[PDB]
Amino acid sequence: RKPPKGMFLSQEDVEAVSANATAATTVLRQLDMELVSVKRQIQNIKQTNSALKEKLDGGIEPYRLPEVIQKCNARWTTEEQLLAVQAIRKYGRDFQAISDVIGNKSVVQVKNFFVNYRRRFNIDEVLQEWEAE
Amino acid sequence: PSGVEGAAFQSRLPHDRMTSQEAACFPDIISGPQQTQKVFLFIRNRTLQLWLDNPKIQLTFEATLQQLEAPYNSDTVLVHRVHSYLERHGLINFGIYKRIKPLPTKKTGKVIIIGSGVSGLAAARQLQSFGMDVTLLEARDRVGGRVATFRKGNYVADLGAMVVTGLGGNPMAVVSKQVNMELAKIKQKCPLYEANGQAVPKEKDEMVEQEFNRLLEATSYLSHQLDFNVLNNKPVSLGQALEVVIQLQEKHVKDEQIEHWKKIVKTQEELKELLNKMVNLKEKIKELHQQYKEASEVKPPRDITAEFLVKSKHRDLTALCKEYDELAETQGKLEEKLQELEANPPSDVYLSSRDRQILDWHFANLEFANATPLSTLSLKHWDQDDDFEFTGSHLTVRNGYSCVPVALAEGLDIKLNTAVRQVRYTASGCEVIAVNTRSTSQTFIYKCDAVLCTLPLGVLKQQPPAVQFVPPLPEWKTSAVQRMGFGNLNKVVLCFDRVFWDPSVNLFGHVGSTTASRGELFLFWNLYKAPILLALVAGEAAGIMENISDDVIVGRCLAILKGIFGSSAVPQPKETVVSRWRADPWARGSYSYVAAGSSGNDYDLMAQPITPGPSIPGAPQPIPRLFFAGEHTIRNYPATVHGALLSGLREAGRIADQFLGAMYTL
Numbered sequence: 001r002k003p004p005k006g007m008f009l010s011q012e013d014v015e016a017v018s019a020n021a022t023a024a025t026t027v028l029r030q031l032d033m034e035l036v037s038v039k040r041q042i043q044n045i046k047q048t049n050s051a052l053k054e055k056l057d058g059g060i061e062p063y064r065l066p067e068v069i070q071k072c073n074a075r076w077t078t079e080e081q082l083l084a085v086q087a088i089r090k091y092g093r094d095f096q097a098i099s100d101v102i103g104n105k106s107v108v109q110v111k112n113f114f115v116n117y118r119r120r121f122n123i124d125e126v127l128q129e130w131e132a133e
Numbered sequence: 134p135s136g137v138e139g140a141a142f143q144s145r146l147p148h149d150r151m152t153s154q155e156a157a158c159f160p161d162i163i164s165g166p167q168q169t170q171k172v173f174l175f176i177r178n179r180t181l182q183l184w185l186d187n188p189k190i191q192l193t194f195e196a197t198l199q200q201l202e203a204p205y206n207s208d209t210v211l212v213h214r215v216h217s218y219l220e221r222h223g224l225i226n227f228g229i230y231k232r233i234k235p236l237p238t239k240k241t242g243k244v245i246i247i248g249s250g251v252s253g254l255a256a257a258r259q260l261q262s263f264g265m266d267v268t269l270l271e272a273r274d275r276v277g278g279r280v281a282t283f284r285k286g287n288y289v290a291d292l293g294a295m296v297v298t299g300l301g302g303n304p305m306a307v308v309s310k311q312v313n314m315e316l317a318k319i320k321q322k323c324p325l326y327e328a329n330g331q332a333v334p335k336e337k338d339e340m341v342e343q344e345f346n347r348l349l350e351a352t353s354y355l356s357h358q359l360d361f362n363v364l365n366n367k368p369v370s371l372g373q374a375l376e377v378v379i380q381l382q383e384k385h386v387k388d389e390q391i392e393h394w395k396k397i398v399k400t401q402e403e404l405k406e407l408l409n410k411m412v413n414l415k416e417k418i419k420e421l422h423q424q425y426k427e428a429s430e431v432k433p434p435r436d437i438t439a440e441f442l443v444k445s446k447h448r449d450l451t452a453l454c455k456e457y458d459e460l461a462e463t464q465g466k467l468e469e470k471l472q473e474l475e476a477n478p479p480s481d482v483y484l485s486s487r488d489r490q491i492l493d494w495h496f497a498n499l500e501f502a503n504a505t506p507l508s509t510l511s512l513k514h515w516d517q518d519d520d521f522e523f524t525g526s527h528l529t530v531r532n533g534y535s536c537v538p539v540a541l542a543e544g545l546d547i548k549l550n551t552a553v554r555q556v557r558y559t560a561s562g563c564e565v566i567a568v569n570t571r572s573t574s575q576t577f578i579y580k581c582d583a584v585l586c587t588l589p590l591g592v593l594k595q596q597p598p599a600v601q602f603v604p605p606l607p608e609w610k611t612s613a614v615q616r617m618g619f620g621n622l623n624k625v626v627l628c629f630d631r632v633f634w635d636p637s638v639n640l641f642g643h644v645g646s647t648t649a650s651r652g653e654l655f656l657f658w659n660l661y662k663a664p665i666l667l668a669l670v671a672g673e674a675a676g677i678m679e680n681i682s683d684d685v686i687v688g689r690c691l692a693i694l695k696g697i698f699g700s701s702a703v704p705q706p707k708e709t710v711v712s713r714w715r716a717d718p719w720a721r722g723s724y725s726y727v728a729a730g731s732s733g734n735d736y737d738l739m740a741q742p743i744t745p746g747p748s749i750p751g752a753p754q755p756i757p758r759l760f761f762a763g764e765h766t767i768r769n770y771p772a773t774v775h776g777a778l779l780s781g782l783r784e785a786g787r788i789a790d791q792f793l794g795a796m797y798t799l
């Protein structure tokens with residue numbers, strides 16, 4: 001009911017090899033052509049990816065910037081408030097990014113900031129201007 | 134199996150069932166109540182046992198009933214019916230046994246037997262055993278036909294059948310007790326050696342062999358599971374099915390490499406797209422670092438937009454620096470996977486050129502066993518007789534297998550050098566016309582009630598006929614003759630004065646350089662007391678080596694032997710014999726095979742006797758007059774000696790039941 005292990009015999013396969021006399025070598029030749037094809041298409045992209053791999057030497061080590069460690073304050077300097085409003089216009093609602101800019105405010109404070117000072121810094125308008133880009 | 138149940142098995146009979154044949158002779162019992170069948174079955178099994186326990190003397194009905202016990206021995210007629218049935222069909226009191234009850238003074242009936250081959254001799258003995266006048270006509274100057282034995286000095290070597298295939302159920306087992314036969318077991322260990330003379334390593338020898346066996350099963354799957362048995366209106370041979378299997382295994386190897394490297398390109402390309410993302414990201418990070426540097430250059434104290442610009446650019450640069458780092462995890466994973474695949478490539482080939490040659494030897498062995506190129510064997514039917522295989526070791530005959538026919542011929546009327554040439558059978562009897570083989574002038578005529586024809590199938594196949602049937606054989610018989618296969622297989626006997634081979638190996642192979650010559654001298658046998666090696670020529674090679682002089686052949690033989698053992702080690706042989714069975718006119722081949730487009734039903738066709746038309750029209754339908762036996766006539770055991778022998782015993786019973794009557798059917 002099942003062919004012996006390691007033997008591949010499907011109904012579909014057998015006509016394909018017995019359609020004519022040379023249908024055997026014809027089918028094998030195409031597979032030989034299919035392999036050589038894929039084989040050099042590998043070394044093509046192996047060399048394409050070899051060049052791309054070189055352009056990335058040095059990585060980005062020179063462009064890295066030291067980690068700034070700030071304990072996380074709670075009062076809003078007038079300075080820190082102004083940083084925020086500009087961050088909203090540049091960054092929309094990406095609170096993590098907005099907190100990153102201010103550096104000393106955790107994300108939750110920023111959302112709260114969006115309400116407490118929502119009237120006075122006229123936020124609502126700012127977000128629409130950020131929506132325009 | 135032991136006991137009375139062993140007797141039935143050793144007689145090729147189920148112990149607990151009545152056979153089709155016993156049904157015909159005992160139709161009362163088989164339609165009868167089940168208890169009587171058990172009675173009968175025991176009486177048969179027991180009687181076989183008695184005969185089997187000692188087959189050197191005749192088993193008389195009287196002797197039988199004595200060793201039988203109640204309640205089995207209550208019904209004498211049942212016992213007499215059973216004993217007489219078994220005696221008639223050669224299941225007891227066959228072969229070479231001493232006569233309790235000596236022959237009747239006057240014989241009844243006259244029968245001519247063509248052929249002194251084992252089929253012939255076995256029927257002849259049986260008929261004479263039954264009180265008939267038997268004469269055998271033989272074209273050769275010796276008996277045994279295709280059981281030939283070369284004998285010179287103390288050298289001895291069969292050029293014909295040389296193997297007994299296991300004594301479990303084999304009638305030759307009985308003949309062995311009857312005739313002393315040096316029966317020597319065949320050690321199955323066979324080392325192969327290539328064209329170079331160096332042995333195959335156990336790694337290959339077992340890898341290739343196991344592939345061979347796997348390849349065979351593959352064809353059985355094609356045959357029985359996929360009905361691959363016709364192709365362009367023509368029946369499929371084993372050879373074709375083997376190629377198709379091999380091609381499909383070579384195909385699957387390529388299919389496997391294609392999807393392997395297509396796994397690589399799927400990954401190289403995932404990498405390509407990943408590096409392009411990384412260049413472009415690095416070039417943006419190059420640009421923001423400059424921008425953040427410039428913004429940091431404006432010395433403070435600055436206004437808050439300029440302070441926002443420094444902080445905003447710094448946030449952005451560390452967000453792009455984060456991306457580029459995650460992408461370099463993802464290139465690390467993908468770089469590792471590419472090395473892994475590049476390290477687990479699938480199998481390069483299906484079989485190497487050396488590997489294909491060892492495979493050829495295993496095919497040559499198969500071409501030897503069936504005495505024919507695999508391209509001719511029917512795929513569906515070639516192994517139809519595998520089901521009735523005997524049990525036990527295969528054996529060889531140390532003292533020459535001719536001892537058996539010669540022993541059977543004792544007591545028989547045999548005309549040697551008598552070439553039958555026309556067979557005339559009519560409603561009133563038959564006439565056989567033969568000539569003398571030495572001077573073909575001197576013509577003989579034999580008249581008898583019936584003719585048993587054990588002419589080899591190669592002879593029956595011959596066009597134009599070496600034997601004319603008058604009237605001609607009906608189409609249903611001649612068509613069976615064309616459809617069937619008569620193969621070929623030749624031997625070369627090498628007689629030396631030194632043993633220079635491994636004496637502990639009975640048989641060792643030689644691997645051929647090409648598929649075409651795979652059977653040319655591909656195997657050697659160490660079987661005799663004297664230093665004699667015996668070399669096969671099977672397959673397509675068999676029929677071709679018959680057009681090449683002995684010397685050339687014995688040359689190629691020595692050369693192969695020199696490669697295995699070194700030029701110094703093997704000397705020139707004292708005596709050399711080469712067979713040519715296809716050339717032999719009383720054989721025209723070696724033995725039969727199940728040709729593509731034939732079937733096992735043809736073997737039954739061959740055995741049906743011929744009944745001629747009535748002489749005076751309107752006269753009653755007559756008796757059958759022409760009977761056939763021989764290895765080509767016995768469906769379940771073709772192409773063997775024991776099969777010949779059984780067919781002899783068969784017709785003898787059939788002829789007897791026709792000319793002497795069977796009183797055991799009441």
Ligand SMILES: Cc1cc2c(cc1C)N1[C@H](O)C[C@@H](c3cccc(C(=O)N(C)C)c3)[C@]13C(=O)NC(=O)N=C3N2C[C@H](O)[C@H](O)[C@H](O)COP(=O)(O)OP(=O)(O)OC[C@H]1O[C@@H](n2cnc3c(N)ncnc32)[C@H](O)[C@@H]1O
Binds near residue numbers: 253273724
């Ligand atoms: C030629 C040859 C025959 C055989 C063998 C070898 C050779 C060379 N050996 C080989 O290793 C193969 C083998 C075997 C072993 C295991 C299994 C199988 C098997 O399963 N397979 C399917 C592969 C095969 C074996 C062997 O070891 N043991 C073995 O078991 N079997 C082997 N075999 C077969 C037997 O050899 C053969 O089958 C019997 O001998 C049958 O004898 P036959 O009696 O029916 O046929 P004859 O030819 O013997 O009788 C004819 C008489 O008619 C005379 N004749 C002709 N024309 C005229 C005329 N015009 N007028 C007057 N007389 C005439 C002729 O002159 C002779 O007098």
